[PDB]
Structure formats: structure tokens, C-alpha cells
Amino acid sequence: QEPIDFLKKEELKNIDLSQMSKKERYKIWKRIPKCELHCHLDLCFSADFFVSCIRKYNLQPNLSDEEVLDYYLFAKGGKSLGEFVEKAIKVADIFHDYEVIEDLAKHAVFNKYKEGVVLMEFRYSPTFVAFKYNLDIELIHQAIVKGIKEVVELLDHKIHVALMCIGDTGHEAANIKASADFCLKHKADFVGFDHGGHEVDLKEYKEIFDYVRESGVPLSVHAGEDVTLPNLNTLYSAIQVLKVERIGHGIRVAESQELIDMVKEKNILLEVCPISNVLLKNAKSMDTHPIRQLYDAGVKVSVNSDDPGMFLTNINDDYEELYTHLNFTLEDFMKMNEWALEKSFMDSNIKDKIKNLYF
């Protein structure tokens, strides 16, 4: 046996969630064999870990643990994706050296294991990690790959972890072209390519994305998240120009039947991040989060944590929110995790292994 007795499809009907306290519900969420596709490793940490980094490098000697969390992180939320990014830029204070990056990666993988994630596609931005202390992106990648490997080996491969590379916008020394080049140079370690930060129309980088995609690295980019944009052009470009297999967030697809139809017919999956959307004010509330209408419309969706570090949450919190506020069932969650598995960028023989073991 292993620490977590994962739920089987047959057992789901015997579990009455309505009887359970929040504490007892989280024991059930933990036992869901989760496939997570959208989580930023470089912003994936616990409160305790973050504060330890701040103390290690004596960054905020005049602030208490709690003041440090309020100063740097996004647990209470904010106004926008713009405000989220400026706060992420502050968090880059911890990227002091390659030792802390390895430790970050190690703890990130281990916590996902503890939470009951069986398939983990992590993503990180080389330029985002490098800029604050002018680090070497080759050495950053080395530290990350090493940290993941060491923990995965310790855990006897009971969690399967893959990496995506993020080109991004909205921080100093950001470079999409260079990020794409780095991704292809390290194609053996990267299973996909993403764009994050500020949400922009990626039509203007058609050539860079064509080149990455056509080289055999599938695309999943952030689009249809930011509700402050005056139209849905970013989604049309993501789908029709970038030819993405998956969309980060994509919650604004719900505002257009045309996009709903296109996404369904192209077998595109939306990587929904419930808590993230609410905290960035991209959903008005969890009660009115678009995932419910998207799910009912027949669009493929999966549940993701996005940034455990920024929000001081974990993947099981997102499951809790969908159950409590939007009446999602264990059967829904199993279905969505199976979609996530089907749409994952991991090697298919690994995916077949995970399917036989849990689904």
C-alpha cells in the first residue's frame, strides 16, 4: 500500500459527500487521483517555504512572517492580472541562487504527491526566474530538472512529472523568441510551450509559435482569462493562428457560442483555475464561475491550482470550491481528470500506465 488509498470509479457511488464535514471532505479530495495540467512551478510553494527563503537571505528583517506573506503574495486577492504580475515580480526576490531553485522544485513535487496528484505537468518561465539576480537559464533549468528527478526517484515514480516552458510578457528581460529557442534546445525535458504574464494577442508571434509547434512541441497558452480586455481576439488567435491543443484558463470562451463550438470540435481542453480566477477578479464569484456553464455545454475542462505560492492554496482547495459553490460531483471530477490525462503532453506509454492504475 501507499499513504493515499486512491478512489476507484466503482467506489464513488458509496461516498456521500453531503454527510461530511469540510475536514472529512478534504480526505476525499486527497484520494481523487488528480491529473493537473496548469501549475507554475516557479510560483508553487507553501507559506512556510516562502518565509524560509525570505529569512535565509535576510530580505525582510523588519517584517513578521505574516507581514511577509501580505507584502509579497496574493492570498487576499487583488484587482487584476496586472496586479498579480507586479506581485509575482516581487516574489522573484527569492530566486537568489540555484540551490533555492532546486529546493523549490523538490518541495513543489513532494507537496503535489502528498495532495494526491498522480500526473503533474509543471511549467516555468526561464526569463522570469533569471532576471532578478541575472542568473543563467541553463543553470536554472539544471537545478529544476535535478530537483524534480531526485524527489520523483525518492517517491519511486508514484507521481509522474513533466515540464513545460513558458515564454512570458510583463517582466524585465522577458523574451518570447529566446524562450522558444530555449524550449527547443531542451526539447528532451519540455513537453509543451506556453505564454503567460500579461495576456496579449499572440497572433503577432505567429512565426515563433509555428516554429515551436511544427518542431513537435505542442502549445497550450494563456488566453481568455483577463476580463478587462475589450474583446475575445486572444482566444481566436490562440485557436485559429497558434493551433493550440489546450488553453490556459479559457474561461471567456463561455461568452461566445462560436468559440464554444470551435473548442469542442477541435477537441481543445480548457485548463480552468477556479481560485485564481476569483482572486484576480476574472470571475465575479465562485457561484458564477464559467466552468459550470462550460462543463454543461460539453466543453472539455480540467481543474488546476495555477499558483499555490501566490494564493497560499493547493489543488484540493480548487476541488473544494467547485463542490461547495457549483455542485460538481466525484463523477465529474473523475471525468475531468481522465480528460486531463487524455490531453496531457506526456509520453503515451506513461499515460497508458497511469490510466490502467487509476482509471
Ligand SMILES: OC[C@H]1O[C@@H](n2cnc3c2N=CNC[C@H]3O)C[C@@H]1O
Ligand atoms: O511562471 C511564471 C510566469 O507565469 C506568469 N503567471 C503565473 N501565474 C499565472 C501567470 N500568468 C497569467 N495569469 C495568471 C496565472 O495563470 C507570471 C510569470 O511571467
Ligand SMILES: [Zn+2]
Ligand atoms: Zn497560469
